[PDB]
Design a protein around this ligand. Sequence first.
Ligand SMILES: Nc1ncnc2c1ncn2[C@@H]1O[C@H](COP(=O)(O)OP(=O)(O)O)[C@@H](O)[C@H]1O
Ligand SMILES: Nc1ncnc2c1ncn2[C@@H]1O[C@H](COP(=O)(O)OP(=O)(O)O)[C@@H](O)[C@H]1O
Ligand SMILES: [Mg+2]
Ligand SMILES: [Mg+2]
Lengths: 359, 359, 606, 153, 152, 165
Amino acid sequence: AALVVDNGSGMCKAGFAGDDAPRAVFPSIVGRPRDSYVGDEAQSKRGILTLKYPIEHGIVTNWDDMEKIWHHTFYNELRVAPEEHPVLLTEAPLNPKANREKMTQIMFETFNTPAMYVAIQAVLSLYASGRTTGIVMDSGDGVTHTVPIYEGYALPHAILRLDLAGRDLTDYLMKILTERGYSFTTTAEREIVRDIKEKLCYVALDFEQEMATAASSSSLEKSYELPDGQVITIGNERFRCPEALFQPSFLGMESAGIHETTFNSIMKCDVDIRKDLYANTVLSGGTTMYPGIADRMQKEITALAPSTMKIKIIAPPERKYSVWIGGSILASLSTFQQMWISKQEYDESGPSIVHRKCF
Amino acid sequence: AALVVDNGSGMCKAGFAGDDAPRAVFPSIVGRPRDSYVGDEAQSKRGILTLKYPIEHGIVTNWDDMEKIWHHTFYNELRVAPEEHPVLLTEAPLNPKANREKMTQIMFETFNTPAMYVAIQAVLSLYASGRTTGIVMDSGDGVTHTVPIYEGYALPHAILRLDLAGRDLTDYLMKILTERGYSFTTTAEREIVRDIKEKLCYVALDFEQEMATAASSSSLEKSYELPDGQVITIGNERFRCPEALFQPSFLGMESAGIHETTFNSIMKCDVDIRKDLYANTVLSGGTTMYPGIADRMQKEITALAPSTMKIKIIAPPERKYSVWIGGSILASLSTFQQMWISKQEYDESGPSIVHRKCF
Amino acid sequence: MPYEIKKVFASLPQVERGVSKIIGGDPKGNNFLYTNGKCVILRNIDNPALADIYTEHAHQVVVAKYAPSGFYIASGDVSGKLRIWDTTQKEHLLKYEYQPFAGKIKDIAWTEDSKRIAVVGEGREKFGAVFLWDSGSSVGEITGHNKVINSVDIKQSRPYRLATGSDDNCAAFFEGPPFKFKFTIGDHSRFVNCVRFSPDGNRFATASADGQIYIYDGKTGEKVCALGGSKAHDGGIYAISWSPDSTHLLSASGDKTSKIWDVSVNSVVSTFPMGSTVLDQQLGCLWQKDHLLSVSLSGYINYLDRNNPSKPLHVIKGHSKSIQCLTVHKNGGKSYIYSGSHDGHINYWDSETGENDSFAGKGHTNQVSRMTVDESGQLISCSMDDTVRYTSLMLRDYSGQGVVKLDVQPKCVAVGPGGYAVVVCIGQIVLLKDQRKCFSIDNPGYEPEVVAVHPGGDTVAIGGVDGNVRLYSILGTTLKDEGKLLEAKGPVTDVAYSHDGAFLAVCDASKVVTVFSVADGYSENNVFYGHHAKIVCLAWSPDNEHFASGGMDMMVYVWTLSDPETRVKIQDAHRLHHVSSLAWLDEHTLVTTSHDASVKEWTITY
Amino acid sequence: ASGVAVSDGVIKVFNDMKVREVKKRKKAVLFCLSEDKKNIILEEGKEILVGDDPYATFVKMLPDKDCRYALYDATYETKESKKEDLVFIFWAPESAPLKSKMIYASSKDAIKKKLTGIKHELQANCYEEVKDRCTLAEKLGGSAVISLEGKPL
Amino acid sequence: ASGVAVSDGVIKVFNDMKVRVKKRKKAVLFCLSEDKKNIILEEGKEILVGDDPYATFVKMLPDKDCRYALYDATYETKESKKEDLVFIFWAPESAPLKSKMIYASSKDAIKKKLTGIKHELQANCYEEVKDRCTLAEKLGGSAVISLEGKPL
Amino acid sequence: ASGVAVSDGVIKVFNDMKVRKSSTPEEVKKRKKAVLFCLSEDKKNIILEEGKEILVGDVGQTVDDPYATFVKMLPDKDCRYALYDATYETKESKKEDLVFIFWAPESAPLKSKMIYASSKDAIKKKLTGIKHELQANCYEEVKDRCTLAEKLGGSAVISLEGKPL
Ligand SMILES: Nc1ncnc2c1ncn2[C@@H]1O[C@H](COP(=O)(O)OP(=O)(O)O)[C@@H](O)[C@H]1O
Ligand SMILES: Nc1ncnc2c1ncn2[C@@H]1O[C@H](COP(=O)(O)OP(=O)(O)O)[C@@H](O)[C@H]1O
Ligand SMILES: [Mg+2]
Ligand SMILES: [Mg+2]
């Protein structure tokens, strides 16, 4: 059996090839005292330690913490020995070649994995959507990537990277929940606010009309039960928190919204392929799971795009783990056994074999 | 005293005739709220406004914004009344005649300048280099132009335009600095990255050899201090950023490099004059100020040139402002006083007078 | 003739780990050829010292192949550009030029009649193209491959057949001309690296990265056998070469050994173990006449010895990386040329016989900036790893020699009598006496670039970016500034005293060579014009009357000191590459090296 | 890349179709994964002969819940000239299972590249996208195309 | 263009030299006026036909300033012996920027005034003017065997 | 926003100082290099200080260092507005720019500091076209000549008022 590991910006998802869903989904953090706690242990260890993200926006910056995260993934989460199972890894778009070779070397030397493979998250999501040409809007925990792919080739000159993702939405929800009188400052309260965001937040098709309706009635209010039994009420903050995706000025950021970033990335491509990109906009990532996000994205892009063009936004129900699921399919195929990078090939061609076998 | 204004794609340089250096050099941007901030004022407000380039590739696109930029130049930068000083302007190569007429109309009607003159930037650089026949590679902020000039007459059929310029180099450095963990996203940080590019970047004579030697080179590593006191460290990215000039594939572009564009422009001329163009290649513009760009350009052009041909890349020390300085001398000459388009000549002849006096 | 090429010390093939290297052989069996950077090297197989270099590609040449008639060679670069050029004349005039596809070219094959060329690689919209040599019109279509094609071969006997091996673990078989797809063989499980038809055409063998070699019939494409039974090699085979009699096969693999197989009986005839390190992996092989060549990962070319498999007959060494420094030394009755490249490798070549070798042991790890020889028969080399190494020139062994560590990266080094060395670092001047640091001139008020020591060991001339040469005196263990400022026309790039110490020659970036006469108060003696680009190297002839300067104009000028108006013009001594360094073997021989990793000698006649 | 191997019959069929007896030439053909899902084989009973509206009877041949590859010899009449060109059609309906969609999408390049010379690709993800003649005309020649399959657009 | 007007002396000299002995001039130097408004003839910067002329003409050119020059080049080929006028624009790199700009921007006026000239030499450093290969190439395309008598 | 209006004299002086119109050499010496604005006795308008100004003609003949004397004119117990025509020189250009200085020492009374800080935005907005602003709250912050250089261009400024740093 092969292992499929998706290294997200804030959440790492590991599982076995052929499974419908990843077995372990845990935060991609490393905590050190203000010895070293990785994953859910760091969250459940009080605020006596500082948290660091080896992957903060898709690109690995601290490899020493990444080795710890992968060790925790293999031994504590998956509970398997990496030396006996081939591992399929996913890399963010526009990943430097040096990071790819370092990942291959770490897998083949530190963990002694018998076989290894690297895939791009955006192309995996596009393939899982049943498409080869289109634009993938992968909005994760710490980074949002708009990747236009034409016939299976991502266009590096038009891939756009946005620092707006679910982490900033959770922080904004924490900030705006204090207006009602609810104090959420600790990490334990941060997880509660994250759960509230995942369970009660939705994207409004028209922000101003929804705000007026919320201010003129109480039909939008919802009740959430805290772990200690207290019940809190939330109103307009249900749609104000995800609205920062389309209006980043709510968080004081310069960059445009996800719809405008998608439009800019589409307009940076050739004119002949813009029509195909407009009609094949695929959403992926945990952040794109807000109800009503597809309709709002379609409306905003249609406003931005020329009238004659046709806008179609793809929101598959499995898009939250579409990066992993497709990989779990790809590594489960009987014909993929020959596509693995064997350890014999590694200690015959160096880390550069990843550029020839994969990519 | 006459005024000399050089309108670039990214920076506008204004000063007085007879001066060694331009008095004001400010970004050629116009900002409007997300009432109207022009130039550096737009840079100091950042996210509250959207920035736009009226001149984005040497050619004027938004005349309304260029009017405000010229007003800012005359009143806020030069701090003089335009109606009392003759103004010498510079126009990009392959500038449409309609743009020339619009410019000479705006100067005489909107600002009531007593006199006006238009000159080609490439011919001004070539004259400032002490030459009348040769090919000028004017690499600016947002555009690069290869202009072959024979006997003071630019050849319109052989002028080549490449969209690769200093703006793309700044964006490339901005992108590759995130691989080290540094977060550069905002407009204000873009100027910091531009300063890093201007101060610490250099062109390597041999790119693969430079990579091979720089792995263990103790002098490659450099440190830069941010305005807020933070210190960033830059290594091989010093020579990777300008390498995109000769290898556009680093940006994902399919276009040719500056050396190949220069060779293509040379090959588009008559065989009789190709020798002079090869022997009189003149570098100009801010982008061509990287240390070691002349040697690299010579080495790359020699490969494409025939076996028996003399390649001489001219890199005068003042090539950064050679367009302006060449103008500043030209307007300061007493004998030039008869070459000014007087307002009376404009009234008798109309906007077409520039087609005769300024050629 | 003012100048004549005498000897060419060819560069080693440019090899990359895990990538097969293709070595071509002529039908006449005289020169075998390979590629390095922008150069195509034709090395004489019988005498590797004799060689020729063709440098006309604007990109990195991947593969070159002789035509079956032996008159033309087709070479392709990474840009998809293919050049067919004549070989009978030393000019190598270009005959035809094509761009079959916009992508890397991997292999080239010719037909028996030598009028059709098949070029394979990885294009934007196609993976191969076979076309007439004189018109470029397609005479077939190469289809059936969805990945890069690494090799191609064409049957040399009627009926014509074509075989391609690619990275989709499959080999396509076509019949023609016109070449049409016949079928795809998918026996291999990894990248198919080399596919070669036998010289008689009766059989063809495909080798892959899975350690298996498959022999198929040359006419029908049906499988005949598998070499070695279960497997042929313990690692990926990168190249194979059929014997001229077409019954034996020579295979080179990544498991650090080569093998000779008897194809007809499926038995291994010979096994040559090449080593036990990563650099000993074999990436290319060739069987021409009785010569068996195997190219290691380090670039060395081993002549395999059938009688003694453990020890090859010859190990042709050299530089596979750009040579940065060059010097000469007369040891005993023979002159050696020592060249240092940017990988830290220092190689010595015999001036007359051309035999070359390398210092034993482990030495420099980065670019060797400069090298020189003192009076005690020691090579002093300053390199980019902040080290100055004193290596004894008679033991030729790196272990047990002198190493001096500098806190700043050195850029130039010069030596003089009395065990005195002056090392210029980045913004610092350091003096070494008896392999010990004893004086530093840190913060000298300028940026030193080059250093020269007077033959008397008393005066040191140091150049700077400002264009001024400053004079120092080595008194005791210190340098005293003499307050003398010789003026040049631009940033000084090299300074060199005369062998007798009567003249100091300074070259700058202003394309001017200024010679000052030491005898009369270091006053200017002459100025030499003629360079049209930045001057990079300068050397003094032993007769103390001529001196040779090489520049970035790809030009070398031999100047006569007495008459500045008379000069010897060596135009394009190394094509497309400026001369990195040069020296003088005697009063009539000039040795020049460049970034093409090649060393050349020129006989100069005045 | 899933790693499936394209059968030689597909390449031979494409080679015959690309060049231009008439009653036996193929106007459309369907490709599909084998039962063991390791070969892109030809569908035996799903093809259209030239001698035998062809686009309508080609579209209805596509399954409603499975992905397929197709090669349609689309003919059209532009203003300046009349031309016939092959189109590679990737039919991936949204109602298809996730595994089939992923395997067909990841292995599309393995068959597309083996058929060198193809220049038009139509990715149909729904029945409306494949029944629509205007998008096929735009893919073929854009605004230059005025009539497709012998009928006005 | 700078608009500097060329004096009638220059055009008279060019015209009488063009029409084809000791009084005749082989080469002549043109300089800029002190007022910087006219192209004038420098006093002691002429070579008489009756009086190697090219080497002396090269030494005659200033090192730190720009000049114009008219040279009656004499090149002999295998077919015949041809004498033709050439215009030389001496603009050394060491010259001040003002002089280089003024001389370059006011070259089209003087050259167009001297109608009937074909060969133009543009020397920006001593190496471009001291040698004879480029001048011979300008005079004749792959046909010049020697120039001014001295063999090439 | 204290609502204090800017008197027409201050606006006229700023307009004359910003734009340099062609004039006789005797009229150039009448230009203002540094000027000081204060509050009216009724604290309703921003009037111009009578004797607290420096002329361009006085620079070089009587005033050796314009900046030192300008700092000397600043009161040590009261808040003022100042307009200084700084002529500096960087590595690439020689610039002449207006600097708005808000002098507010800690020893000044609280009322004056509050009124001057609250009304600074209105007068700054009315003085359109000024980019540099120097906020000085102590004598050490404005006496030195390096603070003005840092505010103007930063470390790129190599000369100030015709003298090296
Ligand atoms: N149902 C949901 N609705 C809204 N947001 C969600 C939902 N599920 C997860 N998220 C958010 O998605 C973020 C990360 O999802 P994911 O795409 O896995 O990130 P990454 O791509 O970095 O692994 C989390 O911060 C979480 O808050
Ligand atoms: N010293 C330098 N080194 C490298 N690049 C520079 C330097 N100075 C300026 N530049 C670049 O030159 C660009 C603009 O120069 P310029 O030629 O004035 O552009 P334009 O003429 O189009 O306005 C800027 O984007 C800047 O990045
Ligand atoms: Mg993700
Ligand atoms: Mg410009």
